[PDB]
């Protein structure tokens, strides 16, 4: 069975950038609900129920017809939130190989930040903005709802290995930012975990 | 150009069902933003800017290619919220021709309610649930994001004239209900304005 993962930090660990109350609600309510609903849909599927969630979301076309949507949505939700928590941490710096690769692929760090900000702001409705590794090249993409680039292009409209991501569902920013998503996107730069991003970049897979 | 409409009531008129803080934010921030962003897109289109928003969204096919998305999203948002405010009121009773048509087309009011709740609950991500009239038959449909059944099947995946509807974007329920959308949907039955739904039905049946 999937479980709600413990966070790598206290709920207030991202203050003053991301608010404590939201972190707690977002974790214990929204993420928990994806875990529960994914588990319910997987009970009848022993051949899928016990795989890692990040594996399952590469396999959606393997499922029975009637399970594809519910697991896209809920295994997507579990995978994405699991990545998100580990992809946040204060006191990191974009540097080393990852910084150089970003400069290579976008021309500069500021070009990459602007492209990411634009993608995050222009995702209408619910979704996620991502930095992905697509073949040799880093890229900025967005997905709808709980879709992940790991699901591939035909399902998610994006592809590549996620390096990091920003949740732009309203629940992620309502309490502190209300409708001001650009303000929330700016605060993300203060809490994106560049150490984990670098680790993921190094691994490539 | 468009304006933020005045409401049929004070922000607290739907207590204790829908919270007054959300009513105020939802009107003055979210709806206002759709009005502003639609108006910005319409500035270069004086042939379209004069249309009632509910007519513009029936004509999205006619816009320039680079205008279609921004106005689908923002004119859809303005139309949908304008309907929503008029579509809420305490103290109404479903009755008369509209009740009878619901009993005809769904078998009973309770069957209808169960179908509406299911559509409202199963709209994954952002969107709306609707009671529509399609020519001569009532139906429950849902849409993504700020799409409306007035936009038609090709664009929105639904069609028909909206008799009433329920906003299921998270901003509409997060403060009071967090991720408990089913509890919010339950409270909608206490504030759906059956008098406005009946008037819209009388005009269109
Ligand atoms: Mn989230
Ligand atoms: Mn709304």
Tab-separated table of N, CA, C and O in Angstrom, chain B residues 2-5 31 34-35 38 53 73-83 146:
chain	number	residue	atom	x	y	z
B	2	UNK	N	-16.297	44.831	-20.301
B	2	UNK	CA	-16.903	44.131	-19.171
B	2	UNK	C	-16.711	44.879	-17.858
B	2	UNK	O	-15.732	45.598	-17.650
B	3	UNK	N	-17.631	44.629	-16.927
B	3	UNK	CA	-17.464	45.118	-15.564
B	3	UNK	C	-17.782	44.001	-14.570
B	3	UNK	O	-18.517	43.063	-14.873
B	4	UNK	N	-17.194	44.111	-13.387
B	4	UNK	CA	-17.579	43.235	-12.286
B	4	UNK	C	-19.011	43.540	-11.867
B	4	UNK	O	-19.310	44.651	-11.434
B	5	UNK	N	-19.922	42.586	-11.980
B	5	UNK	CA	-21.325	42.883	-11.657
B	5	UNK	C	-21.536	43.055	-10.158
B	5	UNK	O	-20.878	42.378	-9.363
B	31	UNK	N	-13.088	36.944	-9.651
B	31	UNK	CA	-13.950	37.354	-10.766
B	31	UNK	C	-13.415	38.625	-11.395
B	31	UNK	O	-13.343	38.739	-12.624
B	34	UNK	N	-10.756	37.901	-13.981
B	34	UNK	CA	-11.262	37.447	-15.275
B	34	UNK	C	-11.787	38.629	-16.087
B	34	UNK	O	-11.573	38.723	-17.302
B	35	UNK	N	-12.515	39.538	-15.452
B	35	UNK	CA	-12.994	40.741	-16.127
B	35	UNK	C	-11.836	41.553	-16.705
B	35	UNK	O	-11.845	41.933	-17.883
B	38	UNK	N	-9.977	39.526	-19.586
B	38	UNK	CA	-10.825	39.563	-20.774
B	38	UNK	C	-10.813	40.934	-21.445
B	38	UNK	O	-10.686	41.039	-22.671
B	53	UNK	N	-21.042	38.988	-22.577
B	53	UNK	CA	-20.058	37.915	-22.405
B	53	UNK	C	-20.671	36.556	-22.699
B	53	UNK	O	-20.040	35.659	-23.275
B	73	UNK	N	-10.706	31.344	-21.698
B	73	UNK	CA	-10.443	31.255	-20.263
B	73	UNK	C	-11.084	32.413	-19.512
B	73	UNK	O	-11.666	32.205	-18.438
B	74	UNK	N	-10.933	33.641	-19.995
B	74	UNK	CA	-11.312	34.811	-19.210
B	74	UNK	C	-12.734	35.273	-19.448
B	74	UNK	O	-13.449	35.637	-18.507
B	75	UNK	N	-13.200	35.252	-20.694
B	75	UNK	CA	-14.631	35.445	-20.918
B	75	UNK	C	-15.433	34.286	-20.342
B	75	UNK	O	-16.505	34.509	-19.773
B	76	UNK	N	-14.943	33.052	-20.465
B	76	UNK	CA	-15.592	31.940	-19.768
B	76	UNK	C	-15.651	32.236	-18.278
B	76	UNK	O	-16.705	32.078	-17.654
B	77	UNK	N	-14.546	32.684	-17.680
B	77	UNK	CA	-14.574	32.966	-16.243
B	77	UNK	C	-15.590	34.031	-15.890
B	77	UNK	O	-16.356	33.912	-14.928
B	78	UNK	N	-15.671	35.102	-16.684
B	78	UNK	CA	-16.633	36.165	-16.414
B	78	UNK	C	-18.057	35.672	-16.578
B	78	UNK	O	-18.917	35.939	-15.729
B	79	UNK	N	-18.350	34.932	-17.645
B	79	UNK	CA	-19.711	34.418	-17.824
B	79	UNK	C	-20.088	33.497	-16.673
B	79	UNK	O	-21.184	33.567	-16.118
B	80	UNK	N	-19.184	32.583	-16.315
B	80	UNK	CA	-19.528	31.557	-15.330
B	80	UNK	C	-19.767	32.173	-13.959
B	80	UNK	O	-20.731	31.802	-13.283
B	81	UNK	N	-18.907	33.114	-13.561
B	81	UNK	CA	-19.113	33.716	-12.244
B	81	UNK	C	-20.362	34.584	-12.217
B	81	UNK	O	-21.067	34.605	-11.208
B	82	UNK	N	-20.655	35.275	-13.308
B	82	UNK	CA	-21.867	36.087	-13.358
B	82	UNK	C	-23.113	35.226	-13.163
B	82	UNK	O	-24.039	35.617	-12.447
B	83	UNK	N	-23.120	34.054	-13.796
B	83	UNK	CA	-24.208	33.100	-13.602
B	83	UNK	C	-24.250	32.607	-12.160
B	83	UNK	O	-25.312	32.513	-11.541
B	146	UNK	N	-12.411	27.229	-16.995
B	146	UNK	CA	-13.525	28.179	-17.074
B	146	UNK	C	-14.352	27.931	-18.330
B	146	UNK	O	-15.060	28.797	-18.838
